[PDB]
Symmetry: D2
């Protein structure tokens, strides 16, 4: 691709291992202007330090907790005032309690079920609504999912039902916003060592199964997710919406 | 033959409810049935509808599935009243008109989370409570629609709630499998019911089935009920985590 | 209850055939059964396995599905001998043994087309001839495996033939639905049979089911048979173009 | 997606409307060296005229009928001697007799069913076996499918079963060749007016349905397929194998 003169919002960098920082490095290398969103103070401090690795001439950082309508609304409105219109959004945001994740699925609390839906699925819908205002000639929105949204995976529990909700959200958003020339798609990433992965029980056995069974016989990394994001966020994928691309060494295709 | 079987049926409002098709079939097969409801008006309908069944007695429980206490205490009383059960038919969903009748991107946070709560989470907590009355095993069936698998015009917030429900069925199947409790869904084709008045363009959905589905006709509540009898019985003993389309073959075409 | 129903069962070779689990179930339910075989050996095997069914007489027809004339003439004779039928169970597949181990990219043209011919095209031509014996409608069921949906090690050429068969089921559903003929598939979990010996690594396939499937056990032929009875009966009115997994839930997990 | 110093073999150009020619135009624009295979001499003649629109300094044209083991085997052997090792193959080849693309599917002949399997699915398998010989360090193999392989579509009939067969071929090949660092993927193209499309009954009503019902409300073109091929054929799609990308205006995702 070639992304000079384009601007993308990346939501959900926490540190150097985040899937979303792989996305940022790829887009930055390709010429894009980037805008970053975070929830914790600590995530902002990591962003400021990670920006030194990038070619970005200015820091554009906005605090946006996606539990709050007003923060998503005011945040995107401020972004539009600061950088003008945008070309797409990369959504790399999910959350569930340890306490629900690490017990039987049938014991999941209502509170923890709805928390995981709210942050990991509904956030895309409201982000799309606000981001559309900054994309009057169209644009591209990408969210990050996992195969536990399509099949029951041991231990992924409440988050597999949130990812199923997220993948349907992508399809319904693609149908709604398609007439505005806004494409919406998902990347189904293979397991990658991150801060959030520490919440998944048996994560090391999940990585070891990919090496042993997946067609490519190896795990993927953040930058490979980034390279598919660049495709999805750019005019290379102009015909493609409502799609879920598995960046997982082909694990999705085998049993 | 379901004699000496007992099933709980959740979600009859009136004679057109999909769950009443399920009841008629199970009743005809000899099952003892227990019914749950939310509104007073639904209990009144159930009382009238039971005169068409062969049930020697009315076993009726109010359970609003938005309340943990109601589900917990509801299934507790069912166990005291009738003993162990063999399965549960879940036929419950809800969403606001306000969110089936605005653009999907304009869905409210409270409307999205309401539909998830009633239409998806309810299965999880009902399974947790019902398992206490199934020590030997049993069978749980929920009702979904093809808009959980593909984006269908107007179905909007309910399609994301059914995608959530269908994953719920798979994760419950994995969890409760070792306890010998199967969990499955029936993906029913469109049927004129009270809830169907919330879906915009409903008559256009029905016509498209008669015109394009393999059987070239719509299904009815009794056909759902006949597939529920298979899922709830020993005929399906090998089958869990599955979604059977009772929809004249519409799911298979494009 | 299948009394006064008549079904043709294709693909019994011995006591371990999936189609023999089917036959035991349909028979127990009071169906009249017709059997087709390829080689005399399966005829004799059949003749003795029949001793264990309550079929008061032996309707046995040699049909090699590689031959149009045999399929055509065989179904014509069935009709003269017994009259109109209510359905067909198809349990027929083949691939050369060297094609069910090692490297898929080394598959010969001849063995790729052989597998397609026997394991997929044979459904098409059987449907066409059996339709003639179903003027009021009926039900056709074929046996498939999860290897038609996902690349499974060793299954190789048979995985591509099963993918072909599953699409075959869907196109036949669409074509034949207006004639009130339903066409569905059962995706059986691994079961030790004669043909099962041909598949590289079969024993490791079984183990993985016990360890990882939701029910934590393997299925058997009779469980495939009970789901066949559902698909072949009026209980599954409204269901066509479907693939029901009878696999302890293995399809639903990763 | 800079492809200078890459070489790709493109199979299945017949004329300017061919999907494989949209692929050719994109890969050539990106700097790749291109080799073309054809069956009919009239296709050779059209390639010769079409090369005048590309930046290729030489015509590398090989006649390969994929019904012939020898022609596939010798053609790829000849290709390796002329240009050396390659980076990937784009497979744009299918065939069925016209009477099997309208009316009733249950009436399909054995001979027409096996013909469509042979040309449209098995050809991928033998091409991958022969192409792997020219890709010692890895590579990428892309085939062209349709949604009729995943769902029963009116009139598509015998070709639907041949595309289901192709899509499983792609998966099994992905698994087999993954340890060799060969990726295998499909593109599921939406309907495009081509010489082959003339054999599909009701084709004009298929096109119209996409415009009326697909998320983007417009049909796709050959160049859009090409842009996705450039992605799948390049290092951008590392970590992606056994996948089927729909380039169809989102129509796959709706019902
Ligand atoms: N790692 C994997 O193996 C894997 C595989 C497939 C998919 N995914 C998906 O990839 C995405 C990114 O996760 P990751 O693995 O890169 O882990 P990560 O670095 O921990 O990133 C997760 C991000 O989510 C943000 N987040 C959580 N709740 C939020 C809220 N209410 N408002 C705003 N942001 C919030 C966190 O921000 P703060 O830290 O500031 O709170 C953090 O930046 C997630 O959707 C995840 O499910 C991960
Ligand atoms: N009709 C169709 O075309 C169709 C097709 C496919 C799937 N479905 C699904 O089929 C199921 C049955 O619906 P239906 O069409 O038969 O309509 P229905 O007759 O309106 O039944 C819907 C039921 O949901 C119950 N319910 C709603 N909220 C509840 C709550 N908070 N607590 C307890 N019960 C609650 C209602 O009870 P009250 O009236 O007492 O409040 C009512 O009995 C639903 O899951 C629906 O999504 C319907
Ligand atoms: N066993 C499993 O784990 C499993 C799992 C899923 C699906 N399946 C499927 O189940 C079906 C039956 O296999 P099985 O396991 O039951 O093995 P089986 O007992 O060996 O049955 C295979 C049958 O195919 C028949 N057959 C082969 N070619 C024929 C031809 N050209 N014309 C007529 N009949 C022909 C054989 O008849 P002859 O012996 O007379 O030649 C034999 O009766 C197959 O479709 C298989 O792919 C099996
Ligand atoms: N057009 C569409 O709407 C569409 C949509 C989705 C997928 N597809 C797929 O796209 C691919 C390309 O088709 P197209 O639409 O671009 O039509 P096309 O221009 O007619 O191309 C079809 C190609 O197949 C080649 N072919 C047929 N038999 C062959 C053989 N035995 N050996 C070698 N080559 C052979 C033809 O070569 P000769 O002319 O030299 O015989 C021709 O170049 C096909 O796989 C098709 O199924 C098309
Ligand atoms: C097993 C691969 C995987 C690892 C990390 C993930 O991110 C999470 C997980 C749970 C809560 C929040 C984010 C994820 O979705 C999938
Ligand atoms: C289009 C077929 C259809 C009709 C009715 C439904 O039930 C609902 C719908 C919305 C809210 C609550 C229940 C449903 O799920 C699917
Ligand atoms: C691995 C489960 C399985 C076992 C047996 C099968 O029947 C065959 C296998 C190969 C050739 C012919 C029939 C089958 O299809 C799948
Ligand atoms: C309806 C979209 C469509 C158009 C053309 C195609 O190419 C063919 C069709 C039949 C025989 C050979 C090639 C194809 O596969 C799909
Ligand atoms: N001991 C944890 C593993 C922690 C992790 O892998 O994230 C478990 O298996 O529950
Ligand atoms: N009147 C609704 C649709 C009515 C229906 O459910 O058929 C509309 O806005 O189209
Ligand atoms: N085919 C490209 C890269 C594709 C791959 O990632 O295998 C190459 O030969 O460099
Ligand atoms: N309309 C013709 C063919 C359409 C075309 O492919 O040009 C038919 O339906 O038979």
């Amino acid at each position: 691709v070639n992304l000079e003169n384009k601007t993308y919002v990346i939501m959900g960098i926490a540190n150097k291992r985040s899937i979303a920082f792989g996305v940022a490095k790829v887009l930055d290398q390709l010429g894009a202007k980037l805008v970053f969103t975070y929830r914790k103070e600590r995530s902002r401090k990591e962003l400021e330090k990670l920006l030194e690795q990038l070619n970005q001439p200015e820091a554009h950082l906005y605090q946006i907790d996606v539990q709050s309508d007003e923060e998503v609304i005011n945040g995107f409105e401020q972004i539009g005032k600061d950088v003008g219109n945008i070309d797409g959004v990369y959504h790399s945001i999910a959350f569930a309690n340890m306490e629900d994740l690490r017990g039987r699925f049938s014991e999941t609390s209502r509170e923890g079920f709805l928390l995981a839906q709210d942050i990991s699925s509904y956030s895309l819908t409201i982000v799309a609504h606000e981001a559309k205002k900054l994309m009057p000639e169209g644009g591209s929105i990408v969210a990050t999912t996992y195969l536990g949204g399509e099949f029951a995976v041991q231990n992924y529990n409440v988050m597999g039902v949130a990812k199923a909700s997220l993948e349907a959200n992508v399809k319904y958003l693609a149908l709604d916003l398609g007439p505005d020339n806004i494409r919406v798609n998902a990347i189904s990433a293979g397991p990658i060592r991150t801060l959030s992965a520490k919440g998944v029980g048996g994560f090391n056995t999940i990585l070891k199964e990919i090496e042993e069974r997946a067609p490519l016989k190896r795990n993927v990394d953040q930058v490979e997710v980034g390279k598919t994001a660049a495709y999805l966020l750019s005019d290379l994928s102009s015909g493609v919406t409502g799609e879920n691309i598995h960046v997982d060494s082909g694990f999705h295709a085998i049993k």
